[PDB]
Design a protein around this ligand. Structure first.
Ligand SMILES: Cc1cc2nc3c(=O)[nH]c(=O)nc-3n(C[C@H](O)[C@H](O)[C@H](O)COP(=O)(O)O)c2cc1C
Ligand SMILES: Cc1cc2nc3c(=O)[nH]c(=O)nc-3n(C[C@H](O)[C@H](O)[C@H](O)COP(=O)(O)O)c2cc1C
Ligand SMILES: Cc1cc2nc3c(=O)[nH]c(=O)nc-3n(C[C@H](O)[C@H](O)[C@H](O)COP(=O)(O)O)c2cc1C
Ligand SMILES: Cc1cc2nc3c(=O)[nH]c(=O)nc-3n(C[C@H](O)[C@H](O)[C@H](O)COP(=O)(O)O)c2cc1C
Lengths: 191, 191, 197, 197
């Protein structure tokens, strides 16, 4: 019943993706969905230098993850890993891990890429962390709406080597599906 | 409600593990559990030459996987992958994949190792295949009963470089937990 | 100096990719390259029924992998893993493992998919087995533009060369795809010479 | 010839491991080794409150990684990933990536855990980023017994050297663990010389 869409975005691609995930999740009667971001780690100075898109979403604390029934994580792909910002935030969940707060909760991952390559590694290396927390891992498989560079691991979008490309209509429907699919799963379990 | 413990074992370590998984799963009111093995791929001649332990369990077909609500896969670790026997069997599930038979079903993995190393890679590379089938992936986290070389990814046992070592009492309780944990999850969903 | 291109192919895509790899490798003077295949596992009646492709390259034995300075492994992606044929074959390298026969030799991997998903996992999950053998792992990263024999080749495949078969299987490797394969072969054969030489 | 041991450590385990690696590397004549650390990310008031360990090695910049023939990366396992400190640092190598600055250089990885789970994933998920940089990846496999400077060292860590901190963090690297670390350094410094030389 409570679903968190937790994301990191520097140039907006994941932020756009996270809105679509939230929309899908919101289609499920039962699901109370909220979107939050992980803190930006770079000082506003270095962020604006690199051309970053200022993020508006409320900043989540590591501790509040425990309140949710499902968490849908969004990260850009950073050389086949989650972002340093998402990795920093997850590194502050050691107290929750020790308590077993996240144990058995639903987890699912979405990503974005630029030139190309690494999106599958980003998603599956994120799963690893969720597994240490004892979270149930939800891939999208081949549903979805309905597939280019898609993966069964989770919704993705291509930004281009430029970062100019915006998520396509089909990438958004996949992202919506993902939110809706895990939300229904969370309601089935929570309900 | 229907739970399959599907395993490959050459020298018995996984077979022993699979019995423990099945026992745990059988503790859940709701769960109809059955143990089956994947076919041995090597001709009986090469099997007996290598010192193999003849497996008794009924041989599963690739097609019957669809009948189950949760599938718990057991494989030895073979240089950080599932065994060639398990990989061969899973390669015959292309018709099910195309049909989406396994989609959204529960999947969970247990393993064994010898000298040491690779068990985490075995489990997480198996997850990959389950994700392509659209299966919900269930790691054990840090429950379990209650941990040596344990992993949150799934139950494991150490056989030694000799292969003489038998699963410990604690490795069996972890394996039982895993069966019981996913079985309760399958009943929660199926019920 | 001795470079083995070792592959598995059901429908011929990896085969074509393997030939590309070997052609690239042959560009390196003092690199002696051979292309071999792992045994088909399914009975030939079932394989031909499946429309499987019959192939010319010699069937490799596990023991002979000891004989090479570099091995470039080719496998179709099978649900984000190597094929069962390749996995069965590598499951027979236990004796090589015990003796350290493959230790410190160069390894590199290329693959093929129907529709793209899982290629990255196939390659990295193959690297794992190579690391158990203590092989040195050669990713292709995003190489210098001008090292590719076909101009405007795009990045997006850092783990190794890949190709798209189509959901159909009817698609064959593009010159862009085969150029990256050729590059991979030339790059690792160059390294094997620099090392062995 | 130039070998960088680049590490992150909160409580000193990777630091000790890094020194072991560098000691092993120094055995290779013509290998010039430096040990540096990635910047700590948490404010020093919070870091000291946490009982974090203050360290002597110089803080590395992303740009200077271009300057080395081999980089041996050290990170504690953090839920089966590298640390956020290491991930933040590598997230700043985008310019090096664009220029191909790290292309074809040797890379290798070592780690540390509290209770063992996830060490394998930390290393292989670090290899991914190195492959994006087109670095050649050096696993340690299960090396020849007699190459280790401490006798009855056991296999079971093919991806790279690891150590156990205890659930407590109070455990320090055993001589058995540090021997494998030393070996890793000596092995990759040997390769870097053979390549660079
Ligand atoms: C250091 C860093 C690493 C990157 N690694 C990759 C990569 O591995 N593959 C890729 O296609 N794009 C890569 N990119 C591009 C980002 O994935 C792309 O800009 C991102 O998906 C944009 O998402 P965002 O708008 O939400 O920030 C990288 C960018 C940076 C800054
Ligand atoms: C080819 C092959 C590969 C192996 N790879 C590993 C390995 O990566 N790590 C390990 O600890 N043991 C390895 N071993 C040992 C097996 O994992 C061990 O014997 C197995 O867990 C026994 O399970 P079983 O009795 O169910 O066959 C390997 C054995 C073979 C035959
Ligand atoms: C059981 C099996 C699993 C497969 N899994 C995938 C998949 O993970 N992703 C994908 O794009 N294609 C998948 N395919 C398509 C194959 O990758 C395709 O047949 C292969 O690349 C053809 O190469 P080849 O002609 O050398 O055999 C699968 C095919 C089979 C037989
Ligand atoms: C947020 C975080 C996540 C951790 N995850 C794991 C884990 O995945 N497995 C494990 O055995 N230890 C884990 N630990 C323990 C660390 O691996 C341990 O603190 C580290 O190895 C110490 O090395 P260092 O002194 O160089 O920092 C974690 C610690 C923290 C801070």
């Amino acid at each position: 019943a409570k679903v968190l869409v937790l994301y990191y975005s520097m140039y907006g691609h994941i932020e756009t993706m996270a809105r679509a995930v939230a929309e899908g999740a919101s289609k499920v009667d039962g699901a109370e969905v909220v979107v939050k971001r992980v803190p930006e780690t770079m000082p506003p100075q270095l962020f604006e230098k690199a051309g970053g898109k200022t993020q508006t979403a409320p900043v989540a604390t590591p501790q509040e993850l425990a309140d949710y029934d499902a968490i849908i994580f969004g990260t850009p792909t950073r050389f086949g890993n989650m972002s340093g910002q998402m990795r920093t935030f997850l590194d502050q969940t050691g107290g929750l891990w020790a308590s077993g707060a996240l144990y058995g909760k639903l987890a699912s991952v979405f990503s974005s890429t630029g030139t190309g390559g690494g999106q599958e590694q980003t998603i599956t290396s994120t799963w690893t962390t969720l597994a240490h927390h004892g979270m149930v891992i939800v891939p999208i498989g081949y549903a979805a709406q309905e597939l280019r560079g898609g993966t069964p691991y989770g919704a993705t979008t291509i930004a281009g080597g430029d970062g100019s490309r915006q998520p396509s209509q089909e990438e958004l429907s996949i992202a919506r599906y993902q939110g809706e699919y895990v939300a229904g799963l969370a309601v089935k379990l929570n309900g």
